[PDB]
Amino acid sequence: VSSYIGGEGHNLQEHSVVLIRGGRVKDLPGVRYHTVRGALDCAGVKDRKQGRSKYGAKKPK
Amino acid sequence: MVVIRLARGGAKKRPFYQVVVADQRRARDGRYIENIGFFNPLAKESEEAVRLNMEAYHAWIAKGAQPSDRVASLVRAYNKA
Amino acid sequence: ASVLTGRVVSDKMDKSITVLIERLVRHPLYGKQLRRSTKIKAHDENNVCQQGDLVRIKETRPISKTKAWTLVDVVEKVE
Amino acid sequence: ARYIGPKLKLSRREGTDLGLKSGVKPYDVKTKKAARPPGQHGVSRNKTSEYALQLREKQKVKRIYGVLERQFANYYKEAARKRGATGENLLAMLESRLDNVVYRMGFGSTRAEARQLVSHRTVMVKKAGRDEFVRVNIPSIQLQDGDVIAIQEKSREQLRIKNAIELATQRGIPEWLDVDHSKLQGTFKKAPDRIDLPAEINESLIVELYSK
Amino acid sequence: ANTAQARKRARQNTKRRQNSASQRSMVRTYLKRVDAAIAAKDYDAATEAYKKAIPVLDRMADKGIIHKNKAARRKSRLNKTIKGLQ
RNA sequence: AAACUGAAGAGUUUGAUCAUGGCUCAGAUUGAACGCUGGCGGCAGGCUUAACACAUGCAAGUCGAGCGGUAACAGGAGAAGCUUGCUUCUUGCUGACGAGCGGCGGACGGGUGAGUAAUACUUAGGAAUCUACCUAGUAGUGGGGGAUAGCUCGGGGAAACUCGAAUUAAUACCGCAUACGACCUACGGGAGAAAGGGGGCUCUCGCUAUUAGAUGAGCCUAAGUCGGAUUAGCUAGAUGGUGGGGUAAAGGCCUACCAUGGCGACGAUCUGUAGCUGGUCUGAGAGGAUGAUCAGCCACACCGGGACUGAGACACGGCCCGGACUCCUACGGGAGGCAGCAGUGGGGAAUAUUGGACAAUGGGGGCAACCCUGAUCCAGCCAUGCCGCGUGUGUGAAGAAGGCCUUUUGGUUGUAAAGCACUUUAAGCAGUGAAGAAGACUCCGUGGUUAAUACCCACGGACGAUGACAUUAGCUGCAGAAUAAGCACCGGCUAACUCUGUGCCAGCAGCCGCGGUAAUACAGAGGGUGCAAGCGUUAAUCGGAAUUACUGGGCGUAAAGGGAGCGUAGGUGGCUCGAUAAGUCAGAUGUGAAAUCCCCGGGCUUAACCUGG
Fold first, then answer.
1. Bridge partners of residue D188, in order along the sequence
2. Sign of the C-alpha dihedral, residues A33, A38, A42, A45?
3. Whole-angstrom Cα distance, residue D176 to residue D147?
4. Which nucleotide comes closest to C2 if you measure CA to C1'?
5. What does this protein's UniProt record list under function (chain A) (predicted)?
6. Using the 8-state DSSP alphabet, how is residue C72 labeled?
7. Of the candidates B33, B34, B30, which has an alpha carbon nearest to the alpha carbon of residue B9?
């Protein structure tokens, strides 16, 4: 199945293990899932601040 | 044989016992033939700690059920009280 | 005991009779009764009743594998 | 939990005084706000809808009584369970809470101070038919009729209690509550009636909000 | 058997099985003689074999290898055929 | 008295309209997972997938008051090398127990839902049954014998163990006599039982026959019970009958023969799926979905099959045969089943400690002492759900400073802060301290008992042996704000708006949709909104959806009248007078387990929770 990588920038490549959740992308035909950022190997968004939990970004200290 | 015994209900560290007539083989919390009384270990003086049905207990004694020792002592205390 | 009255559909079997019972059952959702007929097998020791007769039967210990009923009485004879 | 942020901003958002701060001076002079909604924008277009009004009313009652949404939902469910008007029952429960009753008695100047004072176990509540006082650290305990309230011997000489009592005297004492100052003893003989409670608060909106 | 009590039960069961099997065959042999007498259709032989059979069934029934009702029913079923003959 | 309380819509087809019609959101919910974050307690919950393989430890023992005995441990007695205070061997003399014999238990407790569409379940009945232990009764418990394990001797094997000779005792085994019942009976009569132990001629536990109860299991009957007609015929031991056998018991359960029957559109057969139920969510209701936890029934115990024992098994931690897999082997042969409590590997998005005690309520054995009990009660871990509480409370202005916006000077953050005065719930320290305990044993009195004040049973007293939890629940003090706030969102549905950067790029989205140089829609700051030890996303179920419409929809044009007639089953059906009481209504009884839902009270400091009616 085909999944969408949300957020700005990602580290995914061939033979990377990812976690997949539901959720269709409206304007992408055949894309019916989303990639969970920060779950197994998909790193969170680097400089995310507002919606961090939706993109697997740790709380800046 | 049929043994009258306490059944453990209530909450953790707050035991409440239900006097029940049940087969010896069957478990304490399992099926019981009849319910005759409730026993409450920790209760206020105004509240009635022990309630039992004398007619049913006498009936079961005549029938031949073998009451447990704790229930027998509770019955003795209720009778004297 | 339980007594049921019904027509005897078949008397061909030796020392046996088959009786049809009509009962009304209310449909749970719709609430309208539907006629339901179930065949019950009974034991007739003298084969008194021919096919089409109305007979009364009662429950009894299984005489045979499929028969647990007996023909106590016969009420009406087909013309 | 209890709100830890500025008290005045809540009242400014609601647009009317919530009673969070004791009225030592006039509310208008103290803060000189609440004429307009808080924040930079202040007056704004696109007036709020009726559902927004219902939400505002619920937030008002919760903020006045220092009660979280979870407890408020439990109270509304109990009111609907109970016989009679649901809004009336819910208001009666909010009055029944211990912190509110001590604040009405005047032991605490404000509802938040009363809640802290009760949580600290200075206040003792005796239920009807009980000859021994019991210390309570839960301010949300419902009060049965005829209940008695005492200050602990350690807390008899508290300065804040003494300063609060005369503010309470200026504010007035409700009829249902009976307060003895010399012994610092308060009796909850009857629950407050809806007519006694403020008219301006609207119970119906809270009932509307929970009906989807 | 993972427990010594279970091993003991197994061996005791083996011994008890041997004894019960011997007694059971003792019952069957007498019943077989009565059946053979029935097959010959001789009243005297049937009566003699039935007289021999009688005590065995009750002795074994009390010991419990054969149930009391089974012994009674066998006596009442065999005597029926014997009576029917002649 | 009470249980009788409950119903919202919105965005979107059009230049615009109304209808219709789909799609989407607003709620509750859960054995829940993932992301940020995370102080504390109480009660619950914790492999939904691999019924996949299982290392390891424990989970079923007890009885010497049934018996022969003495392997160990302690003694006692003497033998005392006496080594004078070291000490050793003989004896079952004693408390006691290894092994062996014999009874009871192991069929309960505990686990799982693979199989099962009907030997399952629910519901209401029934007749042909057995039923250890238990309550009430009766009749007994006499006399004998040969065996045999341990023990000895010699072998065999690496082991698991096995073969020979001889031999000892029983509440082990087999006769004989007696027979209240009980069995057969052609009713004339026939046959069938057992064991002794212990306390001082007795009472006692046990045994044999059996009647009645109680409990438990087996059997049967009527109904209800998922999808599929693109599954219409299916059955030949098949339906019934007699003689015979088999069962504790009815029965094609089996068998010889005889007849041709048995089920089917009211759904038979054949397939997919699935344990059923009380209940659990959702919903105003009717309904829909579901069957974790707690409790009832069923089925299974690595796979297939067979039976032994026993009252009860075709037996989770028993037996036999075969099967695959793992292990040991000296190569011929042997051992195994965590779907018991923990625990390991593996699968997965995912679910825990290789813990304490029998102290309490139960179960097994015993006369008791006492032993076992991963049942049970507790304890460790997890925010996994619910409930409660805390992270402080007052007073505080030229409205400090800084950030942000701005018409560059004002506004906002904002009583927010600083200052100032208090307070110490929770956490931590020092103490204190209930309750869960039922009164064992022992002494004394009374009655029953008996030949007996012995013995035994019952009752009534005195007495203080018993606590894992535990360093307890609670109570009192010690110092000080000191130990503790985050998540999502702000175009509309929907509560919350402006800048800066970007420029159909980066990106957001649940729907309409935003992004092409002045973005309330992307990323960042300020501000604000909602929740708050939580907050969102995702997955699922119901709701909204009157969108399968019985309550409660439509069919001229939006989807929908069969091309028309005929007629089978089936559905419905004129007027009057009667019988009948099946449907219908009303009342009586039993049942519809307990819990859960609801109402009124009670107990935990409140709540969850428990609890009487």
1. D147, D177
2. positive
3. 12
4. F125
5. With S4 and S5 plays an important role in translational accuracy.
6. E
7. B30
Reduced to 3 states, what is the DSSP secondary structure of residue D56? helix
Subunits with 3+ C-beta pairs closer than 8 A to E: none
Neighbours of D210 (CB within 10 A): 16
Task: Please give the resolution of this entry in Å, rounded to 1 decimal.
Answer: 3.2
Judged on CB neighbours under 10 Å (0-12, 13-18, 19+), D109 is buried
Give CA–CA dist D212/E26, Å, rounded: 86
Compute, in degrees rounded to 10, the torsion defined by CA atoms D43, D46, D47, D48: -110
Cβ count near D198 (within 10 Å):
9
Neighbours of chain A (3+ CB pairs under 8 A): none
Q: How far is the CA of A44 from the C1' of F350 (A)?
A: 22
Token duo for residue C60: 């009894």
d(CA A22, CA D90): 41
SS3 E52: helix
Tokens matching residue D192: 């407050």
CA of C5 to C1' of F229 (A): 34
How determined?
cryo-EM
Residue nearest to nucleotide F61 (CA to C1'): E5
Measured CA to C1', what is the nucleotide nearest D85?
F5
Nearby residues of E67 by Cβ (< 8 Å), 6 or more positions away: E61
